[PDB]
Design a binder for this molecule. Structure first.
Ligand code: CA
Lengths: 169, 171
């Protein structure tokens, strides 16, 4: 199954390299660059895992309640404000799990012999494998949170992130 | 096994995106940028696949007979000259298969429970899977050559430049 290699590549080649300095970079931002009133950026890296593997080109312009705030100083990571009831309800470092783009592309390539059913199953296995790797990983010190979801009826991505953000604090 | 996902990620996220424009970039370089008094760059992307997963940070430090010439204009790809008997024997776009660095890193990470034997098996599977993908792939139009190799225990019986040259001469 492709999910196993995708989760290991993502952890080894990316997460284990960015997670150790993440809390220091967020701290730097909150203390020296953040001008929001009671808008401290949450301490975890929030990873969007749409199980449908639909990764847009621009995160921000996919939900009006998710607005780009700043680049996280010191790799390119972005800070977003999350709105609820028309007001800022939270701020976090947020991004899509790029290996889902591979699963989407494989389902779009007839020679891969990879159905939408195979894609959904591998997306769930990728999530489960990555969760398992991070649970045993020394770099993951209350540093990373996976946000896996499916669409049902309108969907609110901001509400999904906020439920995880509130689970932190 | 990790090799399947690594091969598919490498093809989807890299090879299929770079290979369609490769021939045009090489042709542009040979016509407009290459020095007048030197060889034309060969037309394929040569991918080094050491089965031991030993990927160097440069490429030249692995062999004095492989010398950096230029960056290929228009994704960062590099052109190298290959030497044989101290002289220029070929010129090509060359690079290591970066997913082998994942296999190497997993073998050093105790929590992965991934031995050197497991790493070698996955390196072979990665090569076989990638070859199978490329064989059926539309982007691969006499555009890519995988160079997989096992390094013998006797150092004197293997030369990386000689391995690239055998494939370059096959072209
Ligand atoms: Ca030896």
């Amino acid at each position: 199954s492709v999910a196993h290699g995708l989760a290991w590549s993502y952890y080894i080649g990316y997460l284990r390299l960015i997670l150790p300095e993440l809390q220091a970079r967020i701290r730097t931002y909150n203390q020296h660059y953040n001008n929001l009133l009671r808008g401290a950026v949450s301490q975890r890296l929030y990873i969007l895992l749409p199980l449908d593997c639909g990764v847009p080109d621009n995160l921000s312009m996919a939900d009006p309640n998710i607005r780009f705030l700043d680049k996280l100083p010191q790799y390119s990571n972005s800070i977003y404000e999350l709105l609820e009831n028309g007001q800022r309800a939270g701020t976090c470092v947020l991004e899509y799990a790029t290996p889902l783009q591979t699963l989407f592309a494989m389902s779009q390539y007839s020679q891969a012999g990879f159905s939408r059913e195979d894609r959904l199953e591998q997306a769930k296995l990728f999530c489960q494998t990555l969760e398992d790797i991070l649970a045993d990983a020394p770099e993951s010190q209350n540093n990373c949170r996976l946000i896996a979801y499916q669409e049902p009826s309108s969907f609110s991505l901001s509400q999904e992130v906020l439920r995880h953000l509130r689970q932190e604090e």
